[PDB]
Amino acid sequence: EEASGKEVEKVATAVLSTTARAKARAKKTKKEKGEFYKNKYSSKPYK
Amino acid sequence: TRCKLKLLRMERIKDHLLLEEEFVSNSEILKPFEKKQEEEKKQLEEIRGNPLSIGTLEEIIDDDHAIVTSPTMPDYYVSILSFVDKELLEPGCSVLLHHKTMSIVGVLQDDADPMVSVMKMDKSPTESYSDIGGLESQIQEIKESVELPLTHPELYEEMGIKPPKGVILYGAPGTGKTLLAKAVANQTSATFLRIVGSELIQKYLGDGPRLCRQIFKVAGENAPSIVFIDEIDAIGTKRYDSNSGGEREIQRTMLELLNQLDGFDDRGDVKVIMATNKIETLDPALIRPGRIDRKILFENPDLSTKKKILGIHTSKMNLSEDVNLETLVTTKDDLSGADIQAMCTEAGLLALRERRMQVTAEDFKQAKERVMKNKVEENLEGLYL
Amino acid sequence: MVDESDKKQQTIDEQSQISPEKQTPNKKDKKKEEEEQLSEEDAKLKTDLELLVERLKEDDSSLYEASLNALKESIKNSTSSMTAVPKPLKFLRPTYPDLCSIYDKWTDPNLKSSLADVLSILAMTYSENGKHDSLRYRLLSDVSDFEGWGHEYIRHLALEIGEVYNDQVEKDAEDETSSDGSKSDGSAATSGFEFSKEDTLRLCLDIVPYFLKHNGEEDAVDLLLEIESIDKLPQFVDENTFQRVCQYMVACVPLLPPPEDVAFLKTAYSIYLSQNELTDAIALAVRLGEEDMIRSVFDATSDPVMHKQLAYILAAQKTSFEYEGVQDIIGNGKLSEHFLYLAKELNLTGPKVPEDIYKSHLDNSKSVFSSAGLDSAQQNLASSFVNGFLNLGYCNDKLIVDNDNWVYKTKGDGMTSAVASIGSIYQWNLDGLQQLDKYLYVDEPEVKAGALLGIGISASGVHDGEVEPALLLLQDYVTNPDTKISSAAILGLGIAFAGSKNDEVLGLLLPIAASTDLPIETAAMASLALAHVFVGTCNGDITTSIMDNFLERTAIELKTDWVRFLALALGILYMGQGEQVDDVLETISAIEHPMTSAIEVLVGSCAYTGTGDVLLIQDLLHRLTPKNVKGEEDAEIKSEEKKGKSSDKDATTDGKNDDEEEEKEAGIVDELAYAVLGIALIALGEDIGKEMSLRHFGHLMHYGNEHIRRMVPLAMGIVSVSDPQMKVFDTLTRFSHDADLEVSMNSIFAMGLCGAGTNNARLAQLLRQLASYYSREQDALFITRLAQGLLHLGKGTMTMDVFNDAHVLNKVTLASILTTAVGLVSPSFMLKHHQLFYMLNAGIRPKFILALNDEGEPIKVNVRVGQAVETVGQAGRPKKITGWITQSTPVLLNHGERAELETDEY
Ligand SMILES: Nc1ncnc2c1ncn2[C@@H]1O[C@H](COP(=O)(O)OP(=O)(O)NP(=O)(O)O)[C@@H](O)[C@H]1O
Ligand SMILES: [Mg+2]
């Protein structure tokens, strides 16, 4: 992704994570209330 | 009971909500700077930079120049450069200077100093009225002079007489003078500044009058107002070093208070209350008699006064209810309410020696005899002839 | 201890010195090991009951912990004894508290969780018998306090509550909800609940409204209705018991859904009706708005004695005080039916007498001549504004008013306002009609209109007297072809008739007179005026207004201002109901525009009132939503956006206002604390958002009716000099009125200093001068609180035109409207039969910080203040009635009520 693609991605999550909890919580509650590193390459053929 | 709970439930939906709103609103989509800030910011940095020397503003000359003093000893004929307008500045304020070239780059400090901290009190005092028991009449003299003109000047106008201004509280330790002042002020719900006199006098030269002038400015803005200057008696005619000095700096601070008392603005709507031993401790000079008007001589508690004051104290000592309020009064020798404070302390002191597990009727009675005995012992028999 | 020999009665004596520990092996080992031994336990039962109480007075933890170790099964839980049926039912009684000692005397979270199930099954089963009723009572009422019972009774009663709590915490409830493992219903349980309510009335205060609310049922209130009528007299004196009841009801309000909220009130009303004081009953009857309820309180007063006596005098007067006037109907009705004196009682129900007492107060206070007469440029306009507000209420100003010079030298919309503000000299007073009519019959169309606005305001206290009615005059003037004469004419129609719903008036104002097709803001006043007429009773939630709102808004939307006026009109109409306000919301939302979405946020704040648990969150989700989308993008078509925003801003502040005022006094402090931090959020998020919120913020104060009218407004106002807008000051001041020349000594001092300070605008100076002048009022002049007074929880009928005008940026046009500010509090006077408009004494408490008293009843020592004391705002507002000195007792209780006092003098 390199540095550019990362920076957008990261800020992008952060907005949505805060924004979900900031509204989802208040509505919902009252809705209701009322390895083989060493593993070489498998000996199987591959194309 | 129930009502308290209600307030807690409301807080737990208010603060939780608030925290989250802030994050989303200030930044994210909306943006915290939203372009305009970014512009101001770039300019501000240029003009500035660290370090920045805090200053004191002596006078403004309308011509975009000012006369400032810094930490360093010589003064500076400096230019005002942008930011704070001349109007929005007040002389006597602490101001922001840029260090390389000293120009007024703003203000944010506003007499950032512990003195300011101690003086300001925007709410009314902790003492509500005639919780204090006895000297009723006395406290209903301080109310005639202070309180009554702020609440209604109408009555004074109609008589054809200036409202009284000022009271001077004087007399004797033990009568809870200081307390009466707080009491009267609370009823008024006057903005009740309060200060210790010891702070206004210091060794360093010329800081004293700055501070003193400021008290008077803050009070007039927030009129109707009471200024309570506690321990005016401190300053007195104490003179640090009797070789020389104490006849320079000390004298200058006293002067300033008086020059502003009547002032260049009419502050008849600023009452003053001076708590003091006597005015003869000070070099007498309290200007305008009718401007300090009625003076209040505290008598010490008498027989009826100390009943009420007693009643508070005995409720703290466990099981002293057994001994009738009246008969406690009778059996002891006539003494001041202060000496009740000494007596009440004596009861607990004896309970501690005994390892009296719970305070009893027997302790409170024993307490009288030892307390009375202390006072007689301390007295010196010179023999009435 | 637990030994086999200690099942013997030789061991009573040896154990008992330290503490009986005999009882453990006798009801554990003997019982479990055989069912043939159950018959033998029966005789030994009575010794065991005696010993149980001694072990609570000799309570210690080691001899319950150490001994019991297998009780749990033996009782019923697993052994499942019941071979002799009757035998184990009686042996429930000692074992149930012993078990509770391993719940509590032994501390262990784990043991607490496990035994929750076991204790509740054992309590329930035996509460049907009412021999378990006998266990609780004997401990609660014993004279001598002890360690053992003192915590254990508390664990027993949490279970009761628990059971009804099961319906709320989970949807599953009953025995599925395994907090208690026991269903809340059943004859056995219903028998146990009912009993306990009697005990905790005497001893507790805060668990009575928790049980009611948690059940969720009006069935809980039906059980309480009956027990409370029995306990009113013997437990405590009536007056004291009534005061406790009233606190409990307001508590139930937050966290009850809208259809149910009102229904709890009707069951409550039944308790009150039975209890003696019919003073308390009427408050709820007004609140509901129901004709049935309002009727039953009256009928109850008048009829029980056929002699006129105090009863009839009382009945008429309680309805009389209220300036809505819907209440006047009931009295007029009873009076036409009766004929003790048709002349006297009909006036006394009528709103003629509230005018009459204002004339009387005036003589005491002396008439104030202070009114401005200034001319030239802007000061010409400023003088017209000051005239009205400074002399608000009935207050002779004959001399300045006779001066026609200043009136006629005014020009523009200002010329109309000059005559409108003379009307406000004679506010709520018959007298001063003559002056307005002088103007009306001469010169410019301007002062003609203005005369009409003035008539409207004066005739207000004749909302239901129908003496020289406005309706007769003002109709002819609608028909006049010029737009200015017409508009004025119909707004007077509104103000004159108040909330009193008169068919001839309602139908006069029912079509907007002028063509809807026209975009004019002179026919805005049709919707504004009609709204007022609707408030103060069950709203019809009329369909005509809704339908026509949509049509005019689509057809012409150029004047952004025009259509805002229409949206606020709906919001005002709906005040005092949220049941039917929900239904109409769907109609609004069905159709869509950003213009429609503006109306939507605003009516929702009104909707969700009757519970602040729901309301507040709604109008803070909302607050974000407009901002956020626009932010996203930024990172005549115009009108649509603008509206969207401006309403959103207003609705934020409104939902708080509707909560704190209607509901609990506790929230008054929570919303005040929340408000200031909420300005700051909005300031960071938008520069533009700040300015709109600031105005509504000073209105937060007046509408909510904060406790403190001294310190906190003054502090606020200093900050709001620096900020843009000074229309914030005008709303702020109506709260600031207080006991003048304390608050209002500061006010004049602040405004004039800052105008001097920086003349940033002449416009700014203007709003600064008018607001400080309005603040001060002389010789205890009548004041206006938005609160009904009588109903401290209440909301105004006609002080919601300030709400209309806060929203829209002030204009020269709008300043005429503001003269209207009718909702003046009446001076209190002692009565009985004399109907003397004077009082010996009345006590006040100078401070207010009470919120335990939702009543706002003060300590009765008080501080005595003379005759003709206008019922001052908050920090003075709680009022007790002085006359015991003369041997008189209030029969009409005051609790900072607006009401004129009445005693039965011995
Ligand atoms: N009417 C009164 N008001 C207040 N305190 C009183 C009164 N009468 C007697 N007292 C007693 O005086 C005590 C407090 O007095 P205190 O604060 O020592 O004095 P002061 O007169 O302000 N002196 P200083 O110690 O020089 O500042 C109270 O705790 C009472 O025991
Ligand atoms: Mg002192």
Q: How many CB atoms lie within 10 A of CB C653?
A: 25
| Token digits of residue C278 | 């019919």
Task: Determine the Cα–Cα distance for residues B81 and B174; give it in Å rounded to an integer.
Answer: 56
Q: Give the pairing type, strands B270-275 and B225-230.
A: parallel
Long-range Cβ contacts of C123-127 (<8 Å, 24+ apart): C123/C96, C123/C156, C123/C159, C123/C160, C123/C192, C124/C163, C124/C182, C124/C186, C124/C188, C124/C189, C124/C192, C125/C76, C125/C92, C125/C188, C126/C89, C126/C92, C126/C93, C126/C96, C126/C188, C127/C188, C127/C189, C127/C191, C127/C192
Residue B345 is assigned to a ligand binding site: no
Task: Determine the Cα–Cα distance for residues B236 and B283; give it in Å rounded to an integer.
Answer: 7
Determine the angle formed by the axes of helices C762-775 and C743-757, rounding to 10 degrees.
170
Task: Determine the Cα–Cα distance for residues B329 and C113; give it in Å rounded to an integer.
Answer: 57
Q: Given the CA of residue B133, which atom of ligand 1 is nearest to it? A: 1
Long-range Cβ contacts of A35-41 (<8 Å, 24+ apart): none
Inter-chain touch B6–C669, beta carbons under 8 Å: no
- DSSP H helical ranges for C34-131: 38-57, 62-65, 71-72, 86-90, 92-103, 109-127
| Token digits of residue C869 | 């004391």
Q: Are C833 and C313 in contact (CB under 8 A)?
A: yes
Mapping DSSP to helix (H, G, I), strand (E, B) and coil, where does residue C426 land? strand
List the single best residue of C611, C617, C629 to mutate versus A (max A Cβ within 10 A): C617
Beta partners for C864?
Answer: C843
Contacts of A10 (CB under 8 A, 6+ apart): none
Q: How many CB atoms lie within 10 A of CB C361?
A: 24
Mapping DSSP to helix (H, G, I), strand (E, B) and coil, where does residue A10 land? helix
Q: How far is CA B302 from the centre of its chain?
A: 29
Solving technique: cryo-EM
For tokens 């719970």, name the residue. B358
Q: How far is the CA of B251 from the centre of ligand 2 (A)?
A: 24
Question: What is the chain B residue with the closest CA to A21?
Answer: B20
Task: Determine the Cα–Cα distance for residues C111 and C113; give it in Å rounded to an integer.
Answer: 5
List the single best residue of A16, A21, A25, A30 to mutate versus C (max C Cβ within 10 A): A30
Task: Determine the Cα–Cα distance for residues C447 and C417; give it in Å rounded to an integer.
Answer: 8
Mapping DSSP to helix (H, G, I), strand (E, B) and coil, where does residue C566 land? helix
DSSP class of residue C378 equals T
For tokens 């408009």, name the residue. C837
Beta partners for B191?
Answer: B225
**CA-CA-CA-CA torsion sign (C618, C619, C625, C628):** negative
Inter-chain touch A30–C613, beta carbons under 8 Å: yes
Task: Determine the Cα–Cα distance for residues B378 and B341; give it in Å rounded to an integer.
Answer: 17
Task: Determine the Cα–Cα distance for residues C608 and C793; give it in Å rounded to an integer.
Answer: 16
How many residues in total does chain A contain?
47
Residue B178 is assigned to a ligand binding site: yes
Q: Give the pairing type, strands B191-196 and B225-230.
A: parallel
Q: Are C167 and C215 in contact (CB under 8 A)?
A: yes
Task: Determine the Cα–Cα distance for residues B347 and C147; give it in Å rounded to an integer.
Answer: 30
Nearest to C582 by CA among C595, C594, C600: C600
Task: Determine the Cα–Cα distance for residues C244 and C228; give it in Å rounded to an integer.
Answer: 11
Burial B37-50 (b: 16+ CB within 10 A, else e): eeeeeeeeeeeeee
Q: Is A30 on the interface with C (CB under 8 A)?
A: yes
Contacts of C809 (CB under 8 A, 6+ apart): C727
Task: Determine the Cα–Cα distance for residues C875 and B162; give it in Å rounded to an integer.
Answer: 29
Question: What is the chain B residue with the closest CA to A13?
Answer: B28
Q: Give the pairing type, strands B270-275 and B75-80.
A: unpaired
Determine the angle formed by the axes of helices C445-458 and C433-440, rounding to 10 degrees.
160
Q: Is B31 on the interface with C (CB under 8 A)?
A: yes
DSSP class of residue C902 equals E
Q: Are B321 and B313 in contact (CB under 8 A)?
A: no
Task: Determine the Cα–Cα distance for residues C522 and C483; give it in Å rounded to an integer.
Answer: 7
Residues from A contacting B (CB-CB < 8 Å) are 15, 18-19, 21-22, 26
Rounded to a whole number of angstroms, the distance from the CA of B27 to the nearest CA of chain A is: 9
Inter-chain touch C711–B36, beta carbons under 8 Å: no
How many residues in total does chain B contain?
385
Q: Is A1 on the interface with C (CB under 8 A)?
A: no
Q: Looking at beta carbons, which residues of chain A come within 8 Å of C617?
A: 26, 30
DSSP class of residue C821 equals -
Task: Determine the Cα–Cα distance for residues B236 and B245; give it in Å rounded to an integer.
Answer: 15
Nearest to C505 by CA among C564, C462, C447: C462
Task: Determine the Cα–Cα distance for residues C573 and C532; give it in Å rounded to an integer.
Answer: 7
Q: Are C646 and C626 in contact (CB under 8 A)?
A: no
Amino acid letter for position C36: E
Task: Determine the Cα–Cα distance for residues C535 and C551; give it in Å rounded to an integer.
Answer: 24
Q: Looking at beta carbons, which residues of chain A come within 8 Å of B28?
A: 15, 18-19
Q: Is C856 on the interface with B (CB under 8 A)?
A: no
Q: How far is CA C835 from the centre of its chain?
A: 30
Rounded to a whole number of angstroms, the distance from the CA of A26 to the nearest CA of chain C is: 7
Q: Hey, what's the torsion of the CAs at B79, B82, B85, B86, to 10 degrees?
A: 10
List the single best residue of B8, B13, B14, B122 to mutate versus C (max C Cβ within 10 A): B14
Rounded to a whole number of angstroms, the distance from the CA of A20 to the nearest CA of chain B is: 10
Task: Determine the Cα–Cα distance for residues C792 and C427; give it in Å rounded to an integer.
Answer: 23
Please give the sequence-ordered ranges of beta strands (E in DSSP) within C357-485, or none if there are none: none
Vertex C819 angle, CA C817 and C821, to 5°: 100
Please give the sequence-ordered ranges of beta strands (E in DSSP) within C242-336, or none if there are none: none
Give all chains having 3 or more CB-to-CB distances under 8 Å with chain A: B, C
Mutate to test the pocket of ligand 1, among B178, B305, B329 (most ligand atoms within 8 A of CB): B178
Rounded to a whole number of angstroms, the distance from the CA of C257 to the nearest CA of chain A is: 6
Rounded to a whole number of angstroms, the distance from the CA of A23 to the nearest CA of chain C is: 7
Q: Are C358 and C429 in contact (CB under 8 A)?
A: yes
Nearest to C212 by CA among C271, C154, C153: C271
How many residues in total does chain C contain?
906
Mapping DSSP to helix (H, G, I), strand (E, B) and coil, where does residue C416 land? helix
Q: Give the pairing type, strands B75-80 and B52-61.
A: unpaired
Nearest to C464 by CA among C358, C349, C359: C349
Q: Are C809 and C688 in contact (CB under 8 A)?
A: no
Task: Determine the Cα–Cα distance for residues A5 and C670; give it in Å rounded to an integer.
Answer: 45
Nearest to C889 by CA among C802, C830, C826, C808: C830
Contacts of B375 (CB under 8 A, 6+ apart): B335, B339
CA distance readout (Å), B78 to B73, B109, B111, C18, C775: 15, 19, 20, 91, 44
DSSP class of residue C6 equals G
Beta partners for B167?
Answer: B273
The resolution of the experimental structure, rounded to one decimal in Å, is 7.8
Task: Determine the Cα–Cα distance for residues B364 and B25; give it in Å rounded to an integer.
Answer: 64
Mapping DSSP to helix (H, G, I), strand (E, B) and coil, where does residue C411 land? coil
**CA-CA-CA-CA torsion sign (B72, B77, B79, B80):** positive
Q: Looking at beta carbons, which residues of chain C come within 8 Å of B31?
A: 631, 634-635
Ligand 1 atom 5, closest CA: B176
Q: Tell me which residues have their CB closer than 6 angstroms to ligand 1.
A: B 132, 134-135, 173-179, 301, 305, 309, 337-338, 340-341
Q: Is B325 on the interface with A (CB under 8 A)?
A: no
| Token digits of residue C111 | 């043991």
Residue B171 is assigned to a ligand binding site: yes
Nearest to B253 by CA among B240, B265, B235: B235
Task: Determine the Cα–Cα distance for residues B168 and B173; give it in Å rounded to an integer.
Answer: 15
Q: Are B216 and B263 in contact (CB under 8 A)?
A: yes
Residue by residue, DSSP assigns C330-341 as HHHHHHHH--S-
| Token digits of residue B83 | 């930011």
Q: Burial of B32 by CB count in 10 Å (0-12 exposed, 13-18 middle, 19+ buried)?
A: exposed
Mapping DSSP to helix (H, G, I), strand (E, B) and coil, where does residue C308 land? coil
Residues 555-614 of C with CB under 8 A from B: 612-613
Burial C765-782 (b: 16+ CB within 10 A, else e): bbbbbbbbbbbbbbebbb
Question: What is the chain A residue with the closest CA to B30?
Answer: A15
Backbone phi, psi, residue B273, to 5°: -130, 115
Contacts of C589 (CB under 8 A, 6+ apart): C596, C600
Inter-chain touch C711–B189, beta carbons under 8 Å: yes
Residue by residue, DSSP assigns C169-210 as H-SS-TTTSTTTSS-S-SHHHHHHHHHHHHHHHHH-SSSHHH
Mapping DSSP to helix (H, G, I), strand (E, B) and coil, where does residue C879 land? strand
Nearest to B90 by CA among B52, B53, B55, B57: B57
DSSP class of residue C76 equals I
Spell out the SS3 assignment of C438-467.
HHHCCCCHHHHHHHHHHHHHHHHHHCCCCC
Burial B97-111 (b: 16+ CB within 10 A, else e): bbeeebbbbbbeeeb
Q: Are C382 and C769 in contact (CB under 8 A)?
A: yes
Mutate to test the pocket of ligand 1, among B140, B175, B184, B231 (most ligand atoms within 8 A of CB): B175
Task: Determine the Cα–Cα distance for residues C466 and C459; give it in Å rounded to an integer.
Answer: 9
Nearest to C209 among B2, B24, B223 (CB): B2
Ligand 1 atom 3, closest CA: B176
Residue B172 is assigned to a ligand binding site: yes
Task: Determine the Cα–Cα distance for residues C698 and C713; give it in Å rounded to an integer.
Answer: 8
Q: How many CB atoms lie within 10 A of CB C380?
A: 18
Q: Are C74 and C31 in contact (CB under 8 A)?
A: yes
Q: How many CB atoms lie within 10 A of CB C490?
A: 26
Spell out the SS3 assignment of chain B.
CHHHHHHHHHHHHHHHHHHHHHHHHHCCCCCCCCCHHHHHHHHHHHHCCCCEEEEEEEEEECCCEEEEECCCCCEEEEEECCCCCCCCCCCCCEEEEECCCCEEEECCCCCCCHHHHHHCCCCCCCCCCCCCCCCHHHHHHHHHHHHHHHHCCHHHHHHCCCCCCCEEEECCCCCCHHHHHHHHHHHHCCEEEEEEHHHCCCCCCCHHHHHHHHHHHHHHHCCCEEEEEECCCCCCCCCCCCCCCCCCHHHHHHHHHHHHHHCCCCCCCEEEEEECCCCCCCCCCCCCHHHCCCEEECCCCCCCHHHHHHHHHHCCCCCCCCCCHHHHHHHCCCCCHHHHHHHHHHHHHHHHHHCCCCCCHHHHHHHHHHHHHHHHHHCCCCCCC
* Ligand closest to CA B233: 1
Nearest to B219 by CA among B156, B265, B284: B265
Mapping DSSP to helix (H, G, I), strand (E, B) and coil, where does residue C797 land? coil
| C-alpha count within 13 angstroms, C-beta hemisphere, residue C215 | 23
Beta partners for B104?
Answer: B80, B97
CA distance readout (Å), C100 to C94, C156, C204, C380, C391: 11, 8, 22, 82, 70
Q: Burial of C373 by CB count in 10 Å (0-12 exposed, 13-18 middle, 19+ buried)?
A: middle
Beta partners for C830?
Answer: C838
Nearest to C352 by CA among C343, C364, C340, C363: C343
Q: Looking at beta carbons, which residues of chain A come within 8 Å of B20?
A: 18, 21-22
Whether residue A45 is preceded by a cis peptide bond, meaning omega within 30 degrees of 0, is: no
Contacts of C372 (CB under 8 A, 6+ apart): C382, C383, C386, C387, C390, C400
| C-alpha count within 13 angstroms, C-beta hemisphere, residue B203 | 2
Q: Are C478 and C513 in contact (CB under 8 A)?
A: yes
Nearest to C617 among A26, A32, A34 (CB): A26
Task: Determine the Cα–Cα distance for residues C806 and C803; give it in Å rounded to an integer.
Answer: 5
Mapping DSSP to helix (H, G, I), strand (E, B) and coil, where does residue C320 land? helix
Q: How far is the CA of B300 from the centre of ligand 1 (A)?
A: 10
CA distance readout (Å), B45 to B53, B84, C526: 15, 15, 57
In the structure, how many helices (H) and strands (E) does chain C have?
46, 5
Q: Is B29 on the interface with A (CB under 8 A)?
A: yes
Nearest to C780 by CA among C847, C845, C869, C880: C869
Inter-chain touch A22–B20, beta carbons under 8 Å: yes
Rounded to a whole number of angstroms, the distance from the CA of A45 to the nearest CA of chain C is: 53
| Token digits of residue C802 | 């300030």
Contacts of B284 (CB under 8 A, 6+ apart): none
Task: Determine the Cα–Cα distance for residues C571 and C535; give it in Å rounded to an integer.
Answer: 11
